[PDB]
Amino acid sequence: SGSYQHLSNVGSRVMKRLGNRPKNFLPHSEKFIKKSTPEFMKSDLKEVDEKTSFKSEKEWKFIPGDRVVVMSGASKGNIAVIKSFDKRTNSFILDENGPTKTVPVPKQFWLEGQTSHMITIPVSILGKDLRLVATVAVRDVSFNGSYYDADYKKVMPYRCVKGQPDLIIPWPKPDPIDVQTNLATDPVIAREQTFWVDSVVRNPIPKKAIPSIRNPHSKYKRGTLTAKDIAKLVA
Amino acid sequence: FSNKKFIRSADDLPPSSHIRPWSIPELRHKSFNDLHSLWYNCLREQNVLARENHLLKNIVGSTHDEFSELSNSIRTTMWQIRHVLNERELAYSASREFLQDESERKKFLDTLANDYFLNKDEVASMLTRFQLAIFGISETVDINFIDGIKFLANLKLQR
């Protein structure tokens, strides 16, 4: 690139205008993007905005790891374990059994054990197009209760089949994250308590540190009135 | 640098699933010195990533952004730390204000006296902690210190 743009926020208004393009000229914007992208990169599904993005595990009806039947497609009536979701598109990438496309790929992105440039790759698919399985497929799932998961380490909801709430579709237990990194502090030290609220006389963090912690010349923090000030103000 | 590498590969980097930024609650029960150390470690990490990120963007013209994401995450932890530092000071100030109101302070002292002091079924240890907590008396001189001494004398007389 030879840019330097990344070390600053210059031409901010222009960037905002470009970034927040009007939605009725979104086809115009993306037409040229589509053209630019090669076949193996580009996706058919609409790149949804971060507002309309499934952040919660309730918003996603399915998690990476669970088993799902595909429908409304070429590879329909096919069971597939969903591998990973795409965040920008609001869609899932399925395993080998799911929907795919055969596309030419350069030798930069060649897998070990390839004869041809042609490679089959999995297309993204929406949560609307595929239904759960348990063999019995599920029409729709609803969430009514919640609980702390041991493996996920989150207060996740209970996936219950729509109609009869007692038939729980359980979450897929994820792979064990064997953490061995120098930049992650271990559980014992991460949580060990070294502070206690003890003193009322001595303040906990020093007076010379305050200017870093908060702006002492803050235009927002208005001063309170006094009697003398009132008297001065009023005729 | 990190392990004397010109650039951390994808394998050399810490993976996203294994890594989490600090929680504000977790930070809240850490000492000042510890927090300061953590902050400086974060800053160091950012510098390492910033060097690398710059190289990636300026020279090779990449859009891989793992380093950038890491830097952002670190920045998040840093501001959370900054927030908890401010919050602690504010809490202290509020406590001071509360104590300054005389009746409330008196009530608090009475409550302290009733439950744990002057009771049976340790006391010295409580007093030493209480001394530090409420007055300027460790094991230098002020009106507050004098008041604490007087209170201690009163407690002794009672007991």
Binding site: S84, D86, T89, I93, F109, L111, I121, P122, S124 | -
Partner: peptide, 15 residues
């Protein structure tokens, strides 16, 4: 999406 898939494939190959 493709890039992420490719990365996953590489990881699988490695392990």
């Amino acid at each position: 999406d493709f890039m992420s898939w490719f990365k996953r494939k590489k990881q699988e190959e490695h392990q």
